[PDB]
Amino acid sequence: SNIGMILKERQDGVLVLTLNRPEKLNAITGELLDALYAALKEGEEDREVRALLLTGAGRAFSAGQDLTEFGDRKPDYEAHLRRYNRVVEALSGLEKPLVVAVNGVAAGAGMSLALWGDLRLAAVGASFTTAFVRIGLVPDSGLSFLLPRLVGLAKAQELLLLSPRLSAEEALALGLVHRVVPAEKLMEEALSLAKELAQGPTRAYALTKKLLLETYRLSLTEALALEAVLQGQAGQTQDHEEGVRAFREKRPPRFQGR
Amino acid sequence: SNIGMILKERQDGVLVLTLNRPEKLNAITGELLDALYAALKEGEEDREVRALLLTGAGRAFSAGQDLTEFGDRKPDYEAHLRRYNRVVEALSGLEKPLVVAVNGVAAGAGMSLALWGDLRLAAVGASFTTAFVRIGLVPDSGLSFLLPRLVGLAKAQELLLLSPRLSAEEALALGLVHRVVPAEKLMEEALSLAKELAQGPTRAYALTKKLLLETYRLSLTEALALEAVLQGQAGQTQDHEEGVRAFREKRPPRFQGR
Amino acid sequence: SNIGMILKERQDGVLVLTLNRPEKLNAITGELLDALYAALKEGEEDREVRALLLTGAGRAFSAGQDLTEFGDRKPDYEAHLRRYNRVVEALSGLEKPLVVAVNGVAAGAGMSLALWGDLRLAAVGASFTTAFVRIGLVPDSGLSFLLPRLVGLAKAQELLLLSPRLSAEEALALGLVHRVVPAEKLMEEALSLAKELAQGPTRAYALTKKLLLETYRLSLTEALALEAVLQGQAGQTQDHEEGVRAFREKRPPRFQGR
């Protein structure tokens, strides 16, 4: 066990975060979410970290909200989500790339959290279930935002209203993940990809993520203006100067994340 | 025939609505749309109804607008659509799940209407054609909203600008429908699914539909806030209390739609 | 060579535009963009033009921005994009249909430009690479707007963050293009399609493009209102009157683009 249930380890330029309540299928609590927030913040502030990798301990990625967090009192989910929505905000705006390695079941808010990865891998055997509807709830933790963007509205309707269990291979066909790998190889493959990202142009990744997060709500005119502003920022980086020299020399760039 | 051209029948918890102008391929008129509005309203108000099913009589689902509704006068489609857009608003915001059973051709506004189903089935032999461009018109009745969300922008461009006729099997591959079934089994299968939905958590369905309708225009911050508000509502339902007990007991929930 | 690097030729009702810096893979410069703007404007103003076709000379469609346009000075990409974003605005709002024929590599802003076609064809052998990230930049020239709409967010993340090279066949599977044809047949097929569009209801195409450009940022209510306004305009065209007569007579319509 560990206090706060988020294991942390640095491998090169990668901060590896592991959801660690395996006896409860990494069920989500406010305590866990505070620890996840703190770990994301530490990774973003750490100049030795250029990428993050998120996975689960044990057989699950996460089964979603721990229903025992709430008393027998009529629940106040508006207040709970207003308090803990900052964690989704933190994932959404992370200024470093995030790889997610889905090692087992991802259900409810566990599915929400997994889908915040920029690049997502699943083990053979892993699964995704929206789950909320089976207990009379709506999608939360950003799932109503992410799912239609990732899989389109037609599949989002079916997945949310009927809550089927999806295999890793079905997840891959829909865009819930980018790659499926055998369970014994998932962490090796996810870490290799995270290490490659940790050598990449971290600022260009950060700014690209911002453009993607906003794309659907902007007019074309607004999107062009935002592209201009963020490209202005990316153009002033040391990494852009390096990138131009490496292309002229037809060699690999040596990026530093600034 | 029936006055207003919308047949209504209740089977258990399902209101079955049938477009009924088969001699004109269920062509849409203002009269028909007023009758459809009234039937949707009655179904939403009826405490014995937990789901709706929409289909067509005869060989078509609907061939779209009846061009004979308009005189030889220069038409005023802005005024016509401003008057009848309330029917699309009613479909979009329905606080009960809607199944559509596409029994034959769905063209123009008939395609628009079919695509408002939450879950959509087509018969083998049915077809979808955007059609508007073939008479020099633009998509209406919400088709410009729904089509890019359901099939993505690339397919929406082709479907709208070239107006190909799509088979049921092509519709399934694009996400225009969720299932294809033999013509003789379509109503049995669509009714079975509607009856399953009529046993489900109707409030969670209603509130999920609201999140989906708004998802693309919201910022992540706004989407999180709306998730919090609607989850607060879903959390106060009798069905959520039931859903938690049924999960703890690992048995099927017995939902009532409140 | 030609001054401004945009070849122009009219074939029937089609203005054919060819990017013409083949020795530099049709690399984009401000000079080229001014010439492209001017050619789009001339085609839109020309009453003998009902469709446009855009392609590249030589082995590339376009390799994107010419990095030699900028001095050794710290670049100001915000000012550069604010100046040249009008060209993307011009493509986005074109009141005639645009076919793109991707004859070879489309990278960076060359990929951006190709994806503004309403209908897009690629040669066998052509390729698409987002490219910006390889020099530490973000997507520009509307690519952050178009790519998630065309391929969905999951594929847009991978394509932008990892910048794989996509084959024509991969592009087709994602929706980056609508058709793949042998290199020796690309211009014949693209011209045939452009000529068909040049016989179509040009106003309905123009107004449909406007609805598509706005669809994701509008509420359903706003989208319905915009459908009403634009359908009102389309309904007053000579082509709509023709379209109704041709459907009643079950013969091909003879559209004029007004």
PDB file of N, CA, C and O in Angstrom, chain B residues 179-244:
ATOM      1  N   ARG B 179     -27.702  -1.156 -35.928  1.00  0.00           N
ATOM      2  CA  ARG B 179     -27.997  -2.564 -36.231  1.00  0.00           C
ATOM      3  C   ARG B 179     -28.772  -2.641 -37.544  1.00  0.00           C
ATOM      4  O   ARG B 179     -29.587  -1.769 -37.806  1.00  0.00           O
ATOM      5  N   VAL B 180     -28.525  -3.703 -38.297  1.00  0.00           N
ATOM      6  CA  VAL B 180     -29.280  -4.101 -39.515  1.00  0.00           C
ATOM      7  C   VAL B 180     -29.926  -5.450 -39.249  1.00  0.00           C
ATOM      8  O   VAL B 180     -29.220  -6.339 -38.780  1.00  0.00           O
ATOM      9  N   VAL B 181     -31.206  -5.576 -39.576  1.00  0.00           N
ATOM     10  CA  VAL B 181     -31.933  -6.832 -39.362  1.00  0.00           C
ATOM     11  C   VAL B 181     -32.833  -7.094 -40.542  1.00  0.00           C
ATOM     12  O   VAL B 181     -33.197  -6.167 -41.265  1.00  0.00           O
ATOM     13  N   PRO B 182     -33.147  -8.383 -40.795  1.00  0.00           N
ATOM     14  CA  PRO B 182     -34.043  -8.700 -41.902  1.00  0.00           C
ATOM     15  C   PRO B 182     -35.362  -7.917 -41.754  1.00  0.00           C
ATOM     16  O   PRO B 182     -35.846  -7.672 -40.624  1.00  0.00           O
ATOM     17  N   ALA B 183     -35.961  -7.530 -42.883  1.00  0.00           N
ATOM     18  CA  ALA B 183     -37.181  -6.689 -42.907  1.00  0.00           C
ATOM     19  C   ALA B 183     -38.270  -7.330 -42.046  1.00  0.00           C
ATOM     20  O   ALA B 183     -38.935  -6.614 -41.331  1.00  0.00           O
ATOM     21  N   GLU B 184     -38.453  -8.650 -42.122  1.00  0.00           N
ATOM     22  CA  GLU B 184     -39.573  -9.327 -41.405  1.00  0.00           C
ATOM     23  C   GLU B 184     -39.349  -9.315 -39.886  1.00  0.00           C
ATOM     24  O   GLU B 184     -40.287  -9.583 -39.154  1.00  0.00           O
ATOM     25  N   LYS B 185     -38.131  -9.025 -39.416  1.00  0.00           N
ATOM     26  CA  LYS B 185     -37.758  -9.042 -37.977  1.00  0.00           C
ATOM     27  C   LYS B 185     -37.522  -7.639 -37.414  1.00  0.00           C
ATOM     28  O   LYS B 185     -37.319  -7.488 -36.205  1.00  0.00           O
ATOM     29  N   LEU B 186     -37.561  -6.605 -38.250  1.00  0.00           N
ATOM     30  CA  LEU B 186     -37.162  -5.255 -37.797  1.00  0.00           C
ATOM     31  C   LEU B 186     -38.054  -4.834 -36.633  1.00  0.00           C
ATOM     32  O   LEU B 186     -37.493  -4.361 -35.638  1.00  0.00           O
ATOM     33  N   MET B 187     -39.366  -4.888 -36.762  1.00  0.00           N
ATOM     34  CA  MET B 187     -40.229  -4.370 -35.681  1.00  0.00           C
ATOM     35  C   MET B 187     -40.091  -5.213 -34.408  1.00  0.00           C
ATOM     36  O   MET B 187     -40.022  -4.630 -33.321  1.00  0.00           O
ATOM     37  N   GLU B 188     -39.956  -6.531 -34.529  1.00  0.00           N
ATOM     38  CA  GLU B 188     -39.740  -7.389 -33.336  1.00  0.00           C
ATOM     39  C   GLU B 188     -38.460  -6.961 -32.624  1.00  0.00           C
ATOM     40  O   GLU B 188     -38.453  -6.808 -31.397  1.00  0.00           O
ATOM     41  N   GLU B 189     -37.385  -6.781 -33.352  1.00  0.00           N
ATOM     42  CA  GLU B 189     -36.085  -6.440 -32.730  1.00  0.00           C
ATOM     43  C   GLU B 189     -36.168  -5.011 -32.162  1.00  0.00           C
ATOM     44  O   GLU B 189     -35.630  -4.770 -31.065  1.00  0.00           O
ATOM     45  N   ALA B 190     -36.743  -4.083 -32.895  1.00  0.00           N
ATOM     46  CA  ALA B 190     -36.766  -2.675 -32.437  1.00  0.00           C
ATOM     47  C   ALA B 190     -37.643  -2.607 -31.188  1.00  0.00           C
ATOM     48  O   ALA B 190     -37.328  -1.887 -30.248  1.00  0.00           O
ATOM     49  N   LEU B 191     -38.769  -3.321 -31.181  1.00  0.00           N
ATOM     50  CA  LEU B 191     -39.665  -3.316 -30.002  1.00  0.00           C
ATOM     51  C   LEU B 191     -38.969  -3.964 -28.799  1.00  0.00           C
ATOM     52  O   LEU B 191     -39.128  -3.487 -27.691  1.00  0.00           O
ATOM     53  N   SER B 192     -38.254  -5.054 -28.999  1.00  0.00           N
ATOM     54  CA  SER B 192     -37.522  -5.717 -27.892  1.00  0.00           C
ATOM     55  C   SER B 192     -36.553  -4.706 -27.288  1.00  0.00           C
ATOM     56  O   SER B 192     -36.452  -4.613 -26.045  1.00  0.00           O
ATOM     57  N   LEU B 193     -35.791  -3.996 -28.126  1.00  0.00           N
ATOM     58  CA  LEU B 193     -34.812  -3.024 -27.590  1.00  0.00           C
ATOM     59  C   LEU B 193     -35.562  -1.891 -26.865  1.00  0.00           C
ATOM     60  O   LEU B 193     -35.178  -1.490 -25.773  1.00  0.00           O
ATOM     61  N   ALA B 194     -36.621  -1.356 -27.444  1.00  0.00           N
ATOM     62  CA  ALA B 194     -37.413  -0.300 -26.797  1.00  0.00           C
ATOM     63  C   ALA B 194     -37.961  -0.779 -25.460  1.00  0.00           C
ATOM     64  O   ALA B 194     -37.960  -0.018 -24.502  1.00  0.00           O
ATOM     65  N   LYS B 195     -38.401  -2.034 -25.367  1.00  0.00           N
ATOM     66  CA  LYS B 195     -38.924  -2.568 -24.094  1.00  0.00           C
ATOM     67  C   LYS B 195     -37.809  -2.658 -23.057  1.00  0.00           C
ATOM     68  O   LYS B 195     -38.061  -2.453 -21.882  1.00  0.00           O
ATOM     69  N   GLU B 196     -36.606  -3.004 -23.477  1.00  0.00           N
ATOM     70  CA  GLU B 196     -35.453  -3.066 -22.553  1.00  0.00           C
ATOM     71  C   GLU B 196     -35.191  -1.655 -22.053  1.00  0.00           C
ATOM     72  O   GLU B 196     -35.022  -1.454 -20.856  1.00  0.00           O
ATOM     73  N   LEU B 197     -35.187  -0.673 -22.956  1.00  0.00           N
ATOM     74  CA  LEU B 197     -34.973   0.728 -22.535  1.00  0.00           C
ATOM     75  C   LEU B 197     -36.084   1.192 -21.613  1.00  0.00           C
ATOM     76  O   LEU B 197     -35.843   1.955 -20.729  1.00  0.00           O
ATOM     77  N   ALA B 198     -37.307   0.733 -21.826  1.00  0.00           N
ATOM     78  CA  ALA B 198     -38.450   1.120 -21.000  1.00  0.00           C
ATOM     79  C   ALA B 198     -38.350   0.522 -19.583  1.00  0.00           C
ATOM     80  O   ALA B 198     -39.136   0.921 -18.732  1.00  0.00           O
ATOM     81  N   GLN B 199     -37.398  -0.386 -19.327  1.00  0.00           N
ATOM     82  CA  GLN B 199     -37.116  -0.903 -17.962  1.00  0.00           C
ATOM     83  C   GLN B 199     -35.901  -0.197 -17.380  1.00  0.00           C
ATOM     84  O   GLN B 199     -35.555  -0.447 -16.228  1.00  0.00           O
ATOM     85  N   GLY B 200     -35.242   0.662 -18.126  1.00  0.00           N
ATOM     86  CA  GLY B 200     -33.990   1.272 -17.701  1.00  0.00           C
ATOM     87  C   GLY B 200     -34.196   2.570 -16.937  1.00  0.00           C
ATOM     88  O   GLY B 200     -35.312   3.043 -16.683  1.00  0.00           O
ATOM     89  N   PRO B 201     -33.070   3.202 -16.558  1.00  0.00           N
ATOM     90  CA  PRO B 201     -33.104   4.407 -15.716  1.00  0.00           C
ATOM     91  C   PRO B 201     -33.397   5.630 -16.592  1.00  0.00           C
ATOM     92  O   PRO B 201     -32.490   6.306 -17.053  1.00  0.00           O
ATOM     93  N   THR B 202     -34.676   5.897 -16.763  1.00  0.00           N
ATOM     94  CA  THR B 202     -35.131   6.883 -17.743  1.00  0.00           C
ATOM     95  C   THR B 202     -34.497   8.264 -17.491  1.00  0.00           C
ATOM     96  O   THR B 202     -34.191   8.988 -18.464  1.00  0.00           O
ATOM     97  N   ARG B 203     -34.354   8.637 -16.237  1.00  0.00           N
ATOM     98  CA  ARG B 203     -33.741   9.950 -15.938  1.00  0.00           C
ATOM     99  C   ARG B 203     -32.286   9.976 -16.386  1.00  0.00           C
ATOM    100  O   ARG B 203     -31.794  11.027 -16.886  1.00  0.00           O
ATOM    101  N   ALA B 204     -31.552   8.912 -16.159  1.00  0.00           N
ATOM    102  CA  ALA B 204     -30.149   8.863 -16.577  1.00  0.00           C
ATOM    103  C   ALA B 204     -30.095   8.935 -18.095  1.00  0.00           C
ATOM    104  O   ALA B 204     -29.261   9.643 -18.647  1.00  0.00           O
ATOM    105  N   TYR B 205     -31.044   8.295 -18.793  1.00  0.00           N
ATOM    106  CA  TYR B 205     -31.068   8.405 -20.271  1.00  0.00           C
ATOM    107  C   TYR B 205     -31.316   9.853 -20.646  1.00  0.00           C
ATOM    108  O   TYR B 205     -30.647  10.396 -21.554  1.00  0.00           O
ATOM    109  N   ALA B 206     -32.298  10.496 -20.059  1.00  0.00           N
ATOM    110  CA  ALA B 206     -32.678  11.868 -20.432  1.00  0.00           C
ATOM    111  C   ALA B 206     -31.504  12.816 -20.253  1.00  0.00           C
ATOM    112  O   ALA B 206     -31.279  13.662 -21.098  1.00  0.00           O
ATOM    113  N   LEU B 207     -30.853  12.706 -19.111  1.00  0.00           N
ATOM    114  CA  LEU B 207     -29.769  13.643 -18.756  1.00  0.00           C
ATOM    115  C   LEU B 207     -28.526  13.364 -19.600  1.00  0.00           C
ATOM    116  O   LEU B 207     -27.823  14.296 -19.994  1.00  0.00           O
ATOM    117  N   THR B 208     -28.268  12.100 -19.912  1.00  0.00           N
ATOM    118  CA  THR B 208     -27.161  11.736 -20.816  1.00  0.00           C
ATOM    119  C   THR B 208     -27.392  12.342 -22.191  1.00  0.00           C
ATOM    120  O   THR B 208     -26.442  12.872 -22.800  1.00  0.00           O
ATOM    121  N   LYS B 209     -28.603  12.292 -22.667  1.00  0.00           N
ATOM    122  CA  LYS B 209     -28.937  12.868 -23.997  1.00  0.00           C
ATOM    123  C   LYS B 209     -28.636  14.357 -24.014  1.00  0.00           C
ATOM    124  O   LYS B 209     -28.137  14.867 -25.027  1.00  0.00           O
ATOM    125  N   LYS B 210     -28.892  15.052 -22.921  1.00  0.00           N
ATOM    126  CA  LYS B 210     -28.624  16.494 -22.824  1.00  0.00           C
ATOM    127  C   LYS B 210     -27.133  16.752 -22.922  1.00  0.00           C
ATOM    128  O   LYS B 210     -26.710  17.678 -23.622  1.00  0.00           O
ATOM    129  N   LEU B 211     -26.327  15.969 -22.203  1.00  0.00           N
ATOM    130  CA  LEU B 211     -24.866  16.125 -22.279  1.00  0.00           C
ATOM    131  C   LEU B 211     -24.360  15.905 -23.691  1.00  0.00           C
ATOM    132  O   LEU B 211     -23.513  16.659 -24.164  1.00  0.00           O
ATOM    133  N   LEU B 212     -24.876  14.885 -24.349  1.00  0.00           N
ATOM    134  CA  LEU B 212     -24.446  14.604 -25.727  1.00  0.00           C
ATOM    135  C   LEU B 212     -24.849  15.716 -26.657  1.00  0.00           C
ATOM    136  O   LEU B 212     -24.040  16.082 -27.527  1.00  0.00           O
ATOM    137  N   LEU B 213     -26.021  16.277 -26.515  1.00  0.00           N
ATOM    138  CA  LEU B 213     -26.506  17.307 -27.465  1.00  0.00           C
ATOM    139  C   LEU B 213     -25.592  18.548 -27.389  1.00  0.00           C
ATOM    140  O   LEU B 213     -25.430  19.242 -28.372  1.00  0.00           O
ATOM    141  N   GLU B 214     -25.045  18.827 -26.209  1.00  0.00           N
ATOM    142  CA  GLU B 214     -24.235  20.063 -25.992  1.00  0.00           C
ATOM    143  C   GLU B 214     -22.740  19.821 -26.212  1.00  0.00           C
ATOM    144  O   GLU B 214     -22.022  20.832 -26.212  1.00  0.00           O
ATOM    145  N   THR B 215     -22.242  18.583 -26.229  1.00  0.00           N
ATOM    146  CA  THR B 215     -20.787  18.263 -25.970  1.00  0.00           C
ATOM    147  C   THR B 215     -19.882  19.094 -26.892  1.00  0.00           C
ATOM    148  O   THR B 215     -18.773  19.579 -26.477  1.00  0.00           O
ATOM    149  N   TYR B 216     -20.215  19.231 -28.140  1.00  0.00           N
ATOM    150  CA  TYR B 216     -19.206  19.789 -29.065  1.00  0.00           C
ATOM    151  C   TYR B 216     -19.012  21.307 -28.895  1.00  0.00           C
ATOM    152  O   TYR B 216     -17.933  21.802 -29.212  1.00  0.00           O
ATOM    153  N   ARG B 217     -20.037  22.019 -28.459  1.00  0.00           N
ATOM    154  CA  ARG B 217     -19.938  23.486 -28.345  1.00  0.00           C
ATOM    155  C   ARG B 217     -19.377  23.928 -27.008  1.00  0.00           C
ATOM    156  O   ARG B 217     -19.133  25.105 -26.889  1.00  0.00           O
ATOM    157  N   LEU B 218     -19.272  23.028 -26.043  1.00  0.00           N
ATOM    158  CA  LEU B 218     -18.765  23.430 -24.705  1.00  0.00           C
ATOM    159  C   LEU B 218     -17.258  23.354 -24.620  1.00  0.00           C
ATOM    160  O   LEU B 218     -16.640  22.455 -25.172  1.00  0.00           O
ATOM    161  N   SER B 219     -16.688  24.277 -23.871  1.00  0.00           N
ATOM    162  CA  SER B 219     -15.306  24.102 -23.390  1.00  0.00           C
ATOM    163  C   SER B 219     -15.280  22.904 -22.431  1.00  0.00           C
ATOM    164  O   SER B 219     -16.308  22.553 -21.835  1.00  0.00           O
ATOM    165  N   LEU B 220     -14.116  22.341 -22.214  1.00  0.00           N
ATOM    166  CA  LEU B 220     -13.994  21.307 -21.190  1.00  0.00           C
ATOM    167  C   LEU B 220     -14.500  21.835 -19.850  1.00  0.00           C
ATOM    168  O   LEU B 220     -15.220  21.116 -19.135  1.00  0.00           O
ATOM    169  N   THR B 221     -14.141  23.057 -19.492  1.00  0.00           N
ATOM    170  CA  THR B 221     -14.582  23.627 -18.210  1.00  0.00           C
ATOM    171  C   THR B 221     -16.120  23.658 -18.116  1.00  0.00           C
ATOM    172  O   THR B 221     -16.706  23.245 -17.089  1.00  0.00           O
ATOM    173  N   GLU B 222     -16.743  24.101 -19.185  1.00  0.00           N
ATOM    174  CA  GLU B 222     -18.222  24.158 -19.177  1.00  0.00           C
ATOM    175  C   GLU B 222     -18.800  22.756 -19.125  1.00  0.00           C
ATOM    176  O   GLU B 222     -19.832  22.549 -18.487  1.00  0.00           O
ATOM    177  N   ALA B 223     -18.223  21.813 -19.840  1.00  0.00           N
ATOM    178  CA  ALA B 223     -18.727  20.436 -19.866  1.00  0.00           C
ATOM    179  C   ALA B 223     -18.610  19.826 -18.475  1.00  0.00           C
ATOM    180  O   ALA B 223     -19.536  19.135 -18.013  1.00  0.00           O
ATOM    181  N   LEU B 224     -17.499  20.042 -17.783  1.00  0.00           N
ATOM    182  CA  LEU B 224     -17.343  19.540 -16.421  1.00  0.00           C
ATOM    183  C   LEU B 224     -18.417  20.109 -15.503  1.00  0.00           C
ATOM    184  O   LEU B 224     -18.940  19.411 -14.636  1.00  0.00           O
ATOM    185  N   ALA B 225     -18.681  21.410 -15.586  1.00  0.00           N
ATOM    186  CA  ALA B 225     -19.708  22.059 -14.761  1.00  0.00           C
ATOM    187  C   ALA B 225     -21.080  21.463 -15.052  1.00  0.00           C
ATOM    188  O   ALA B 225     -21.863  21.206 -14.146  1.00  0.00           O
ATOM    189  N   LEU B 226     -21.372  21.186 -16.305  1.00  0.00           N
ATOM    190  CA  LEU B 226     -22.697  20.639 -16.683  1.00  0.00           C
ATOM    191  C   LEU B 226     -22.800  19.190 -16.206  1.00  0.00           C
ATOM    192  O   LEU B 226     -23.859  18.796 -15.693  1.00  0.00           O
ATOM    193  N   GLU B 227     -21.712  18.423 -16.353  1.00  0.00           N
ATOM    194  CA  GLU B 227     -21.678  17.073 -15.769  1.00  0.00           C
ATOM    195  C   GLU B 227     -21.981  17.121 -14.272  1.00  0.00           C
ATOM    196  O   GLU B 227     -22.753  16.306 -13.746  1.00  0.00           O
ATOM    197  N   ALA B 228     -21.387  18.069 -13.576  1.00  0.00           N
ATOM    198  CA  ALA B 228     -21.614  18.186 -12.114  1.00  0.00           C
ATOM    199  C   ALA B 228     -23.101  18.456 -11.841  1.00  0.00           C
ATOM    200  O   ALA B 228     -23.683  17.837 -10.962  1.00  0.00           O
ATOM    201  N   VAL B 229     -23.685  19.421 -12.541  1.00  0.00           N
ATOM    202  CA  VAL B 229     -25.093  19.756 -12.301  1.00  0.00           C
ATOM    203  C   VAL B 229     -25.973  18.559 -12.593  1.00  0.00           C
ATOM    204  O   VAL B 229     -26.850  18.206 -11.785  1.00  0.00           O
ATOM    205  N   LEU B 230     -25.797  17.900 -13.746  1.00  0.00           N
ATOM    206  CA  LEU B 230     -26.724  16.821 -14.120  1.00  0.00           C
ATOM    207  C   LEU B 230     -26.470  15.584 -13.277  1.00  0.00           C
ATOM    208  O   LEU B 230     -27.417  14.880 -12.974  1.00  0.00           O
ATOM    209  N   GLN B 231     -25.211  15.292 -12.952  1.00  0.00           N
ATOM    210  CA  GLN B 231     -24.973  14.172 -12.033  1.00  0.00           C
ATOM    211  C   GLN B 231     -25.592  14.465 -10.670  1.00  0.00           C
ATOM    212  O   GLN B 231     -26.075  13.516 -10.013  1.00  0.00           O
ATOM    213  N   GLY B 232     -25.603  15.693 -10.239  1.00  0.00           N
ATOM    214  CA  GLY B 232     -26.262  16.046  -8.966  1.00  0.00           C
ATOM    215  C   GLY B 232     -27.712  15.652  -9.033  1.00  0.00           C
ATOM    216  O   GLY B 232     -28.280  15.073  -8.078  1.00  0.00           O
ATOM    217  N   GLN B 233     -28.364  15.957 -10.155  1.00  0.00           N
ATOM    218  CA  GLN B 233     -29.783  15.582 -10.373  1.00  0.00           C
ATOM    219  C   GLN B 233     -29.905  14.059 -10.419  1.00  0.00           C
ATOM    220  O   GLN B 233     -30.802  13.506  -9.739  1.00  0.00           O
ATOM    221  N   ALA B 234     -29.106  13.383 -11.218  1.00  0.00           N
ATOM    222  CA  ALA B 234     -29.221  11.918 -11.328  1.00  0.00           C
ATOM    223  C   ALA B 234     -28.997  11.238  -9.955  1.00  0.00           C
ATOM    224  O   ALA B 234     -29.679  10.271  -9.602  1.00  0.00           O
ATOM    225  N   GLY B 235     -28.129  11.787  -9.136  1.00  0.00           N
ATOM    226  CA  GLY B 235     -27.774  11.224  -7.834  1.00  0.00           C
ATOM    227  C   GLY B 235     -28.923  11.317  -6.852  1.00  0.00           C
ATOM    228  O   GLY B 235     -28.905  10.561  -5.879  1.00  0.00           O
ATOM    229  N   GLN B 236     -29.887  12.205  -7.091  1.00  0.00           N
ATOM    230  CA  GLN B 236     -31.015  12.382  -6.165  1.00  0.00           C
ATOM    231  C   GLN B 236     -32.214  11.529  -6.572  1.00  0.00           C
ATOM    232  O   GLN B 236     -33.202  11.503  -5.864  1.00  0.00           O
ATOM    233  N   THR B 237     -32.104  10.771  -7.653  1.00  0.00           N
ATOM    234  CA  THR B 237     -33.219   9.948  -8.138  1.00  0.00           C
ATOM    235  C   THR B 237     -33.382   8.685  -7.260  1.00  0.00           C
ATOM    236  O   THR B 237     -32.395   8.100  -6.753  1.00  0.00           O
ATOM    237  N   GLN B 238     -34.597   8.182  -7.218  1.00  0.00           N
ATOM    238  CA  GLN B 238     -34.853   6.864  -6.612  1.00  0.00           C
ATOM    239  C   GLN B 238     -34.092   5.789  -7.374  1.00  0.00           C
ATOM    240  O   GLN B 238     -33.543   4.868  -6.757  1.00  0.00           O
ATOM    241  N   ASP B 239     -33.972   5.943  -8.689  1.00  0.00           N
ATOM    242  CA  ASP B 239     -33.282   4.909  -9.495  1.00  0.00           C
ATOM    243  C   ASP B 239     -31.791   4.827  -9.135  1.00  0.00           C
ATOM    244  O   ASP B 239     -31.260   3.729  -9.162  1.00  0.00           O
ATOM    245  N   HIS B 240     -31.149   5.947  -8.822  1.00  0.00           N
ATOM    246  CA  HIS B 240     -29.737   5.820  -8.432  1.00  0.00           C
ATOM    247  C   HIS B 240     -29.612   5.016  -7.140  1.00  0.00           C
ATOM    248  O   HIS B 240     -28.701   4.174  -7.028  1.00  0.00           O
ATOM    249  N   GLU B 241     -30.490   5.242  -6.193  1.00  0.00           N
ATOM    250  CA  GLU B 241     -30.465   4.501  -4.894  1.00  0.00           C
ATOM    251  C   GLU B 241     -30.643   3.010  -5.146  1.00  0.00           C
ATOM    252  O   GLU B 241     -29.848   2.157  -4.642  1.00  0.00           O
ATOM    253  N   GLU B 242     -31.563   2.688  -6.049  1.00  0.00           N
ATOM    254  CA  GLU B 242     -31.790   1.305  -6.480  1.00  0.00           C
ATOM    255  C   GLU B 242     -30.577   0.742  -7.190  1.00  0.00           C
ATOM    256  O   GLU B 242     -30.227  -0.446  -6.957  1.00  0.00           O
ATOM    257  N   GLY B 243     -30.000   1.516  -8.090  1.00  0.00           N
ATOM    258  CA  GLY B 243     -28.837   1.054  -8.845  1.00  0.00           C
ATOM    259  C   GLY B 243     -27.678   0.688  -7.921  1.00  0.00           C
ATOM    260  O   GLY B 243     -27.011  -0.340  -8.175  1.00  0.00           O
ATOM    261  N   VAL B 244     -27.450   1.484  -6.881  1.00  0.00           N
ATOM    262  CA  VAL B 244     -26.341   1.206  -5.930  1.00  0.00           C
ATOM    263  C   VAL B 244     -26.653  -0.083  -5.165  1.00  0.00           C
ATOM    264  O   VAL B 244     -25.737  -0.975  -5.010  1.00  0.00           O
TER     265      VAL B 244
END
